[PDB]
Amino acid sequence: EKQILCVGLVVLDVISLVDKYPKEDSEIRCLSQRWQRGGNASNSCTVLSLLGAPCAFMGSMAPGHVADFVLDDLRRYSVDLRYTVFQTTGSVPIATVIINEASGSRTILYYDRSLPDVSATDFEKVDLTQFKWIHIEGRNASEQVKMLQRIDAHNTRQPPEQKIRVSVEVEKPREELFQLFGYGDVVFVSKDVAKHLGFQSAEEALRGLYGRVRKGAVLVCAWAEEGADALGPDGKLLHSDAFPPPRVVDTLGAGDTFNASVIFSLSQGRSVQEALRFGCQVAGKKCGLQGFDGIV
Amino acid sequence: EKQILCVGLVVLDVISLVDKYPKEDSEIRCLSQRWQRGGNASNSCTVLSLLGAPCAFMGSMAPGHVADFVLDDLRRYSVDLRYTVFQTTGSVPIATVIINEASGSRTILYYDRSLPDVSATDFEKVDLTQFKWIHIEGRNASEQVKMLQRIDAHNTRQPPEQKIRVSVEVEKPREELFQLFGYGDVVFVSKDVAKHLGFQSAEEALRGLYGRVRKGAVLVCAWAEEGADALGPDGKLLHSDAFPPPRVVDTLGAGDTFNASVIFSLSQGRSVQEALRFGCQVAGKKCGLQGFDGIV
């Protein structure tokens, strides 16, 4: 069984659990503080692994005790780390995460880039024959476009049977990332990006942006409590309602869980409509649990 | 010149500077993240040192890289650490501090006690003859009352000329701490404690609580932008208006700066009225600066 490769950046989430969202200028005693491995594509590997799909993670890494914590954790999920790009400068990024016990909301304070990104030349070294799906978390787009061109060139020399399926996520509302819309068989665009571009609903965003994706591609937009929508070459808008848990306790990585679950379902040969449904359900289940493990 | 001893707990402040206060459930890129030594009595040593008063700090400590950072920092200010109480269990407490660049507000997320407190038996080892003033940050009150009884017993065997002046801070609205009101020549009570007990202004709190302090004591209550008030045995309410800086950039430790500056002024023989004024002015100056060093 060929692997699913995720290219992205691992982040250390330093999570403070509070009984209510802190009022500016107050002092509040937290219920707990914990470390959790995070990062979008990183979290998606966790979920893919939990769902039973062998996968590999490619990201930059700075040796030290933080690296040990996050790499050990990836190893626990049997994520293949052959393509870890070790950097002799910079550090693993940290995100300070406030979770409101009352609501499950997650509020993320993150920082400037703390280490070099995975480059096109790094990706050149990947043995593409090992993978049936490659997902790219949009970040350093000019480099990633080259990576995507490399996969495309590879696929031209392949039977349709042996083509590597590609997905990309455009989550941050940064201009440089929009070029990624034209790559990938599946394109995840965030609600935040949609709203930044002036769309007020997933349906609106999908209709508004479909003209930018590559021929044959499926564009997917999750819209929180409003569920998720997709639009493919046939012009039929597809939708799944959200599947909230009875009590929301932790929504950190819920979007990553959605992405992973859609990739999983699609990679398993399911329809887009079913993949959306499955994504919403697994993401919802996740929101009712601390971290990811209880989704299975 | 005998030292001023501060008994309290050193804290590592992990400070995230943000351009606006984060909205719940958002993700925000911080401007910077820095480590700063904190803790109330710890910060007051910094200020006392900067103002030119030799001082000593007594608190619990767990060896490790965090201890090294905070102890090196205390050494930079020439704070005497002879009475550091090393603990073979627990860790230096962390406080997660969000500072709003726009307002200078500080929002503090702190955690359960991470190491043993300084005990009465620890304090027994202090050479009281070395100190002309001892300030206690209220925390483990039952133990600290014994410490205060030890100082009292010491002072009975002294000339008035050689009596150690004592101050206590009651900052958290915790019942156990109220017993400390009856100790100390100078009693700092926080606005938060006052409000918890049903008073709506410093004047109200002082009148409301003076009957609980020891004969001769001065009760002090700072009330933020409303300045600070004090009440002594003569029943005359004293007041200083706040002295805001032209632009408030960082209010973390402003209250500690006030406390230290009042202790300093009083220890220098100044009147309570002048000490209040001086406290408000130095605290105000501090609020216009990052950290403490520019106050002098």
Q: Is B256 annotated as a binding residue?
A: yes
Cβ-contact A170, A189 below 8 angstroms? yes
**Cβ contact A56:A4 at 8 Å:** yes
Nearest CB neighbour to A111, from listed B24, B26, B29: B29
| CB-based contact B28 A110, cutoff 8 Å | yes
Terminus-to-terminus CA distance in chain B, angstroms? 21
Q: At what angle do helices B40-51 and B65-76 cross, to 10 degrees?
A: 30
Helix (H) or strand (E) holding B258: helix B254-267
Best B21, B29, B91, B109 member to test A by mutation, with max A CBs in 10 Å, is B109
Chain A residues interacting with chain B (CB cutoff of 8 angstroms): 16, 18, 21-30, 32-33, 94, 96, 98, 100, 103, 105-112, 251
DSSP H or E stretch at residue B83: none
Token pair recorded at residue B138: 């209220």
Cα B39 to the chain's mean position, in Å?
8
Resolution of the coordinates, Å: 1.9
CB contact under 8 A, B107 and A21: no
Give residues after which chain A gaps, C-N over 2.5 angstroms: none
| List of chain A residues whose C-beta atoms are within 8 Å of the C-beta of residue B22 | 98, 107, 109
Q: Which of B167, B152, B84 is nearest to B118 (CA)?
A: B84
A28 chain-B contacts, CB cut-off 8 A: 108-110
Torsion angle in degrees (nearest 10) through CA of A221, A144, A282, A172: -50
Q: How many domains does the structure of chain A reveal?
A: 1
| List of chain A residues whose C-beta atoms are within 8 Å of the C-beta of residue B20 | none
Q: Flag if B109 and A22 touch (Cβ within 8 Å).
A: yes
Of the partner residues B28, B106, B112, the one whose CB lies closest to the CB of residue A25:
B106
User: CB distance A27–B110 less than 8 Å?
Assistant: yes
CB B275 within 8 A of CB B235: no
Say which CATH number the domain at B198 has: 3.40.1190.20
Q: Is B138 annotated as a binding residue?
A: no
CB distance A18–B111 less than 8 Å?
Answer: no
Which residue type, as a one-letter code, is found at position B35? W
Place of tokens 């200028």: A25
> Do the strands A94-100 and A106-110 form a parallel or antiparallel pair, or are they unpaired?
antiparallel
Closest CA to A155 of A164, A168, A146, A142: A164
């848990």: which residue's tokens? A245
Tokens of A65: 């005790």
If one counts every other C-beta atom within 10 angstroms of the C-beta of residue A44, the result is 30
Bin A43: left if φ > 0, else alpha if -120 < ψ < 50, else beta. alpha
Contact A47, A260 (CB under 8 A): yes
Q: Say which residues have a Cβ less than 8 Å from residue A121's Cβ, sequence separation at least 6.
A: none
Tell me which residue has tokens 């049903």: B198
Query: Looking at residue A42, what DSSP letter applies?
Result: H
**Reduced to 3 DSSP states, what percent helix, strand and coil does chain A have, rounded to the nearest 5?**
40, 25, 40
Cα–Cα distance for residue pair B135/B112, rounded to 1 Å: 23
Taking CB atoms and an 8 Å limit, are A109 and B23 in contact across chains? Answer: no
Contacts of A112 in chain B (CB under 8 A): 29
Q: Which two tokens stand for residue B5?
A: 């001893």
DSSP state of B80: B
Say if residue A294 is exposed, middle or buried (CB neighbours under 10 Å; 0-12, 13-18, 19+): exposed
- How many degrees, rounded to 5, is the angle at CA A140 between CA A139 and CA A145? 105
Tally of helices (H runs) and strands (E runs) in chain B: 8, 15
- Calpha distance A53→A57 (Å, rounded): 13
Distance (Å, rounded) from C-alpha B231 to C-alpha B189?
A: 12
B105: chain A residues, CB-CB within 8 Å: 24-25
Taking alpha carbons only, the member of A276, A252, A266, A256 closest to residue A110 is A252
Provide, as residue numbers in chain A, all residues whose Cβ is less than 8 Å from the Cβ of B16.
96, 109, 111
Dihedral through CA A26, CA A31, CA A36, CA A38, nearest 10? -40
Structural domain of residue B92, as residue ranges? 1-296
- What is the helix (H) or strand (E) element at residue B189, kind and residue range? strand B186-189
Name the structure determination technique.
X-ray
DSSP for residue A163: P
Residue position matching structure tokens 């940064």: A174
State which residue of chain A sits closest to B172, comparing Cα positions: A27
- CA-CA distance, A201 to A221, in Å (whole number)? 9
